[PDB]
Design a protein around this ligand. Structure first.
Ligand SMILES: [Mg+2]
Ligand SMILES: [Mg+2]
Ligand SMILES: [Mg+2]
Ligand SMILES: [Mg+2]
Ligand SMILES: [Mg+2]
Ligand SMILES: [Mg+2]
Ligand SMILES: [Mg+2]
Ligand SMILES: [Mg+2]
Ligand SMILES: [Mg+2]
Ligand SMILES: [Mg+2]
Ligand SMILES: [Mg+2]
Ligand SMILES: [Mg+2]
Ligand SMILES: [Mg+2]
Ligand SMILES: [Mg+2]
Ligand SMILES: [Mg+2]
Ligand SMILES: [Mg+2]
Ligand SMILES: [Mg+2]
Ligand SMILES: [Mg+2]
Ligand SMILES: [Mg+2]
Ligand SMILES: [Mg+2]
Ligand SMILES: [Mg+2]
Ligand SMILES: [Mg+2]
Ligand SMILES: [Mg+2]
Ligand SMILES: [Mg+2]
Ligand SMILES: [Mg+2]
Ligand SMILES: [Mg+2]
Ligand SMILES: [Mg+2]
Ligand SMILES: [Mg+2]
Ligand SMILES: [Mg+2]
Ligand SMILES: [Mg+2]
Ligand SMILES: [Mg+2]
Ligand SMILES: [Mg+2]
Ligand SMILES: [Mg+2]
Lengths: 80, 206, 70, 60, 143, 141, 67, 145, 55, 63
RNA sequence: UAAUUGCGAUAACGAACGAGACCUUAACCUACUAAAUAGUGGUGCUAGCAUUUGCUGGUUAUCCACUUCUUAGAGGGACUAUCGGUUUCAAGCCGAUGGAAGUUUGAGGCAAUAACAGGUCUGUGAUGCCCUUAGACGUUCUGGGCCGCACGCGCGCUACACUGACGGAGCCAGCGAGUCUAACCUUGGCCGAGAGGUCUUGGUAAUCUUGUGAAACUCCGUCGUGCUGGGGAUAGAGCAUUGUAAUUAUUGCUCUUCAACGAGGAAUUCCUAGUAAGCGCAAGUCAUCAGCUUGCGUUGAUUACGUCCCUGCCCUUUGUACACACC
């Protein structure tokens, strides 16, 4: 007891936070949104938080039996 | 030769031949000449060497292989057939012995004899499997000097090894037998045979 | 089995009167002269050097080498 | 250097590709002759996340 | 001039010392010699038959002269080589600790080596003495 | 303190250090004369520098060398390199330049790397073969 | 195969364009120049650049070069 | 060693332990063509017999051969260790034998029979002409019987 | 039991050795199905409305 | 027997389906001022010396 | 060009993802900052041999100084540099010299867009739906089984010996890893033919195991071409180790038994320099078991430095009634 201590700490803009933006999609879809609305919104907001670029992939299955994926990018990224 | 010595001392013949002439295990590099025009440039001899071992970078360029001292090329080609791959100390010693042996028979710088069996075994012309349509004839070709040296060494050591296999005669002895029979070409050597035949067919198909 | 494992007195004398002209003598040469296998032929190598003919010009296991006396 | 060398696949199919991770461990020591005051001062501070600082004593 | 053994090549030395320890007659030869192998990693026993314990004695001694201290383990590891596990790959294997340990105890009783602190067996000063001596002797045959 | 340099030699992973000081002419390796050495066939390889440059040369100097690493041939090349490098390092601080450069000349000329270290080294094996380039074996079906 | 990527050749172009006096068929100094005079992030890439701009100079000296 | 001589002395081929033994082989190995005398056994027996192993089967006195046999079939008496022996701890009288020659065949018979007679898996396995030391039998030995 | 197993002829090696070997021993892979891999069996199909609602 | 020596003066290129053959113009030695084109079998450079086994006859293509 | 890498041609100009850059590791720093957990020289304490100085050791501190070697921070270094050939005198390519280094410096890490009904629901307390749910398809306990053997296929290990086996003797690596609320890495001493046993011991580690004295290899012997002393399958008897348990034999040792295999048809794999091949080691797995893997160093070649003949693949042009796209 007392040899361990927790503090919270707001994060300087969730906008450049992969983890935050993923959790945000999770919530958008889970909260019964649209697909492109959710994604394009996350993206437009990440961009708006002044990012160099960003990309959101949704893979799996929506409403139709067969699985599909979708890339939603804007701005600029490097890959290698 | 003027001897000299210091603390830990250096043996007689050692001092002697060392500082004077720059010769082999202990054989002359001076004299020793390539009795076939061409082949010179592709048989080394001078710069002279003590033993045929060298951390040689003779591969990284197309032709520099040529520049490697001949005797060491021979010993190199000794150290194959799987079991023996690597094992240059083995090979080198086999050569020292071989040269002693060859020397015993008929004198000559034995390195000169080697030089001769090498000159005397490269095929002046050969053949390749040209198409010409399914039933492939054979177009006579005149073969490079480099290929001639290469193939000479290959042949000599192969025949020497194949001979030596499964009998009491030891590698150096049969290598010296092939070398000798070949140096002044005598159709009792596997090498000379194979050259003569390559050129027989190469004539036969021009 | 096919022979050369003993000494048959005639063989000994044979060894003494046959070993000149042998510019090369070794384990192998002695066998090749239709006699002594590499056991007792090694002994022959040690014992022609007892005194005479063979002049030691090389050294070791596997390879030995000698020349006619002078 | 701690290597861990694993198949990439979670199963078995595919050409057998191998992959290898490392954690690099860097260690250092500085020996210092001082009194209690300066050691305690200097070592309560200089604190740093990720750096494991250990202070011993003695000559045995 | 002055002398050590380091001034004398392995073989002719160790054979010089073999022939010596032999001659001498003082030694200790366990008795299981001749009926024994030298390592589980071996096929046949030694060919020197009468002797070879002198050969290893010499070898061991010179090995210990040429360094601080050495134990039975290090010698087993040294004197050991490849064992054919027949049809399954070769692996190095240690040699017998009896042969060695007994050899040490022998040379020690003969005062040519001594239980060292630190661990193991250090060459004796009288070992230094006698070894440098026959070393010298071996260069003296060569004169 | 007498005049003295240190040098080294390197083939594969073997490394051979030379201490080359003013002496009455010893040439020892680890702790034995340079006459022992064995490898043996290769023995001349280590004599090689001395004879290339005249046996005298070592009379104002004591030479000692110690090799660790590599293996048998590996160590021979390292020690010889260390010795020739040594001799030259010594003529560079104590004798005059022209002498040193005459020695670099006779080594560098004939050579076997004596002054310069061979850069060849192990290449790492990569999964899918017992070697670096060697790939395993396939049957198709 | 030793052929220089765009970024390298592009940079030689621009540099020679705007700093031809200073620069001089010597890599060694053109190098140092590049340090003092432009901002690169790897030694390697900077060298590559200098060496090529050095080449380009070295051949401008004997008649013009397109681009 | 030495250039030797002798006369009619040595007779090629000689017969011990109900078998035959070639002359002109290095004796230690001659003894081997008998059943139950691996190279080691032979070596130690010869050393115990006080014989010059440098000899062929060739030479050797009759006497010498006699001693050789005596020791071969009474190892424990002429101080041979017993861990050196192919049949220690019988399984009935519990003595230690080094079973030799035409008798090792019998002893194999005996043991295999004991296993079969007692119905033990090893026995059944033998009777079936299969491998008994537990090796996989899918792939190996198909040339077989 | 074990008495059974040794006493049972129609057992052991000789007996097998003397029997012919079946041909399905020396068979081949089988394969069964592959040029149907792209051809869906479900017989179901999706539909542009459901897909457009989803995606 | 009549040997004929020729010096490689120009390397033309590789022929043969496999492509291990090399076409070369050679100036023979015992009397220059005359050139012939032969086909090699080994690796070849400018100034090597071929032993034309037969002195007059020359090729071109190779499949 | 390794590269949509560039030059050049040019209704295009100028750019971005990817390649490149970047990062890691291997190479070079008598320049920098240092070190009893790395080492060198001097000095003391001291052994041996010569004796005329000398030569070779002992001594985790008896002190002094150093940083060449070792360690790892910071820098520096290379840019295919200089010169010359060749090329549309372009990007480039080649040779020579210099150089630690000039094959993308060697080797890796990262790696766009798109595709596949590739494999994985048996890695997951990731998961839809179906099934099952107390005579369980939950779970645990005892015992067996995945190892079963006429035989087809793949990866492998060991061999056919004399560039060798055996036996003395010489004797040299690099990458690793190790015990707290525990029994891990183990030196040394004894006992034991061996395997192993036993008493102590150092180490939570650049400190101890450990210079991991590894194996191929080197040297002096034995054997002598004989299925031989090559080879060591199969099998018998005995001894020990892990484990609650060893039978269908975990593994280790000793004696004995001594097979096929005399270089392997049609076919077919892999490979360009410290590479190939030979050789061992450490790590993973692990109570015990490596003939496997992943890395590591040791010994260290022959042959190309080319092409499109075989095969495979990308690219143009071309045809299409295909577009769920030749399944
Ligand atoms: Mg990029
Ligand atoms: Mg060893
Ligand atoms: Mg050994
Ligand atoms: Mg490797
Ligand atoms: Mg037997
Ligand atoms: Mg590419
Ligand atoms: Mg004095
Ligand atoms: Mg004095
Ligand atoms: Mg430093
Ligand atoms: Mg150069
Ligand atoms: Mg790099
Ligand atoms: Mg899964
Ligand atoms: Mg489920
Ligand atoms: Mg799992
Ligand atoms: Mg998960
Ligand atoms: Mg279930
Ligand atoms: Mg299974
Ligand atoms: Mg299969
Ligand atoms: Mg596989
Ligand atoms: Mg050996
Ligand atoms: Mg006991
Ligand atoms: Mg403790
Ligand atoms: Mg180490
Ligand atoms: Mg046979
Ligand atoms: Mg054997
Ligand atoms: Mg069991
Ligand atoms: Mg079973
Ligand atoms: Mg046999
Ligand atoms: Mg073969
Ligand atoms: Mg198991
Ligand atoms: Mg393991
Ligand atoms: Mg496995
Ligand atoms: Mg049409």
């Amino acid at each position: 007891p007392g040899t361990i201590v927790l503090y919270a700490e707001r994060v300087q803009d969730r906008g450049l936070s992969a983890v935050a933006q993923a959790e945000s999609m999770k919530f958008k879809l889970l909260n019964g949104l649209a697909i492109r609305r959710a994604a394009y919104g996350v993206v437009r907001y990440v961009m708006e938080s002044g990012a160099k670029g960003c990309e959101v992939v949704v893979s799996g299955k929506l409403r139709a039996a067969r699985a599909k994926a979708m890339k939603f990018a804007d701005g600029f990224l490097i890959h290698s | 030769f003027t001897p000299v010595v210091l603390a830990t001392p250096i043996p007689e013949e050692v001092q002697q031949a060392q500082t004077e002439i720059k010769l082999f295990n202990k054989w002359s590099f001076e004299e020793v000449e390539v009795k076939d025009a061409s082949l010179v440039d592709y048989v080394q001899v001078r710069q002279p060497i003590f033993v045929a071992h060298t951390a040689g970078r003779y591969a990284n360029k197309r032709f520099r292989k040529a520049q490697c001292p001949i005797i060491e090329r021979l010993t190199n080609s000794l150290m194959m057939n799987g079991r023996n791959n690597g094992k240059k100390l083995k090979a080198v010693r086999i050569i020292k012995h071989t040269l002693d042996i060859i020397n015993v028979l008929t004198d000559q710088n034995p390195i000169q004899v080697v030089v001769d069996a090498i000159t005397n075994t490269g095929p002046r012309e050969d053949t390749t499997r040209v198409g010409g349509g399914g039933a492939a004839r054979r177009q006579a070709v005149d073969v490079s000097p480099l290929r001639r040296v290469n193939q000479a060494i290959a042949l000599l050591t192969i025949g020497a090894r194949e001979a030596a296999f499964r009998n009491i005669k030891t590698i150096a002895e049969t290598l010296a037998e092939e070398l000798i029979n070949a140096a002044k070409g005598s159709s009792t050597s596997y090498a000379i045979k194979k050259k003569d035949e390559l050129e027989r067919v190469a004539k036969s198909n021009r | 089995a096919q022979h050369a494992v003993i000494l048959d007195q005639e063989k000994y004398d044979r060894i003494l009167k046959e070993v000149p002209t042998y510019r090369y003598v070794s384990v192998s040469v002695l066998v090749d002269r239709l006699k002594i296998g590499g056991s007792l032929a090694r002994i022959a190598l040690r014992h022609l050097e007892k005194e005479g003919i063979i002049k030691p010009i090389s050294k070791h296991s596997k390879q030995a080498i000698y020349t006619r006396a002078t | 250097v701690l290597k861990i060398s694993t198949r990439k696949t979670p199963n078995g199919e595919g050409s057998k590709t191998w992959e290898t991770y490392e954690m690099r461990i860097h260690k250092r020591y500085i020996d210092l002759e001082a009194p209690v005051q300066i050691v305690k001062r200097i070592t309560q501070i200089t604190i740093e996340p990720g750096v494991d600082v250990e202070v011993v004593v003695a000559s045995n | 001039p002055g002398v050590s053994v380091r001034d004398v090549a392995a073989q002719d030395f160790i054979n010089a010392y073999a022939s010596f320890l032999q001659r001498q007659g003082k030694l200790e030869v366990p008795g299981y010699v001749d009926i024994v192998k030298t390592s589980s990693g071996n096929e046949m026993p030694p060919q020197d038959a009468e002797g070879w314990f002198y050969k290893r004695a010499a070898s061991v001694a010179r090995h210990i002269y040429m360094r601080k201290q050495v134990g039975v383990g290090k010698l087993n590891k040294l004197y050991g080589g490849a064992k054919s596990r027949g049809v399954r790959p070769y692996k190095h294997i240690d040699a017998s600790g009896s042969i060695n340990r007994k050899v040490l105890q022998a040379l020690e009783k003969i005062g040519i080596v001594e239980i060292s602190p630190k661990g193991g067996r250090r060459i004796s000063e009288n070992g230094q003495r006698d070894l440098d001596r026959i070393a010298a002797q071996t260069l003296e045959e060569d004169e | 303190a007498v005049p003295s340099v240190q040098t080294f030699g390197k083939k594969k992973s073997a490394t051979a250090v030379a201490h080359v000081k003013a002496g009455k002419g010893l040439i020892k390796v680890n702790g034995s004369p340079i006459t022992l050495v064995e490898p043996e066939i290769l023995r001349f390889k280590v004599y090689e520098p001395l004879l290339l440059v005249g046996l005298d040369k070592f009379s104002n100097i004591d030479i000692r060398v110690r090799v660790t690493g590599g293996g048998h041939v590996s160590q021979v090349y390292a020690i010889r390199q260390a010795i020739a490098k040594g001799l030259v390092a010594y003529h560079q601080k104590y004798v005059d330049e022209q002498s040193k450069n005459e020695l670099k000349k006779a080594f560098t000329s004939y050579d076997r790397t004596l002054l310069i270290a061979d850069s060849r080294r192990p290449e790492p094996k990569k999964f899918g073969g017992k070697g670096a380039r060697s790939r395993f074996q396939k049957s198709y079906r | 195969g030793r052929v220089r990527t765009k970024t390298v050749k592009r940079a030689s172009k621009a540099l020679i364009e705007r700093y031809y006096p200073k620069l001089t068929l010597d890599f060694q100094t053109n190098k140092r120049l590049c340090d003092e005079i432009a901002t690169i992030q790897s030694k390697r890439l900077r060298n590559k650049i200098a060496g090529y701009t050095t080449h380009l100079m070295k051949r401008i000296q004997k008649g013009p070069v397109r681009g | 060693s030495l250039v030797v001589q002798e006369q009619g002395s040595f007779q090629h081929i000689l017969r011990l332990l109900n078998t035959n033994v070639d002359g002109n082989i290095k004796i230690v190995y001659a003894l081997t063509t008998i059943k139950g005398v691996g190279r080691r056994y032979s070596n130690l027996v010869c050393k115990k017999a006080d014989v010059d192993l440098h000899k062929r089967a060739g030479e050797l006195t009759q006497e010498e051969l006699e001693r050789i046999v005596q020791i071969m079939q009474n190892p424990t008496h002429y101080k041979i260790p017993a861990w050196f022996l192919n049949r220690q701890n019988d399984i009935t009288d519990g003595k230690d034998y080094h079973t030799l020659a035409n008798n090792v065949e019998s002893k194999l018979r005996d043991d295999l029979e004991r296993l079969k007679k007692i119905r033990a898996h090893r026995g059944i396995r033998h009777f079936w002409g299969l491998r008994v030391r537990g090796q996989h039998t899918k792939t190996t030995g198909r040339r077989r019987a | 039991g074990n008495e059974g197993a040794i006493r049972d002829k129609t057992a052991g090696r000789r007996n097998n050795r003397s029997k012919d070997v079946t041909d399905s021993a020396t068979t081949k892979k089988s394969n069964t199905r592959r040029a149907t891999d792209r051809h869906s069996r479900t017989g179901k199909t999706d539909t542009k409305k459901k897909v457009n609602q989803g995606w | 027997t009549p040997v004929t020596l020729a010096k490689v003066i120009k390397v033309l290129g590789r022929t043969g389906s496999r492509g291990g053959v090399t076409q070369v113009r050679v100036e023979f030695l015992e009397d220059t001022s005359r050139t012939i084109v032969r086909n090699v079998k080994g690796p070849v450079r400018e100034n090597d010396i071929l032993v034309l086994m037969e002195s007059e006859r020359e090729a071109r293509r190779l499949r």
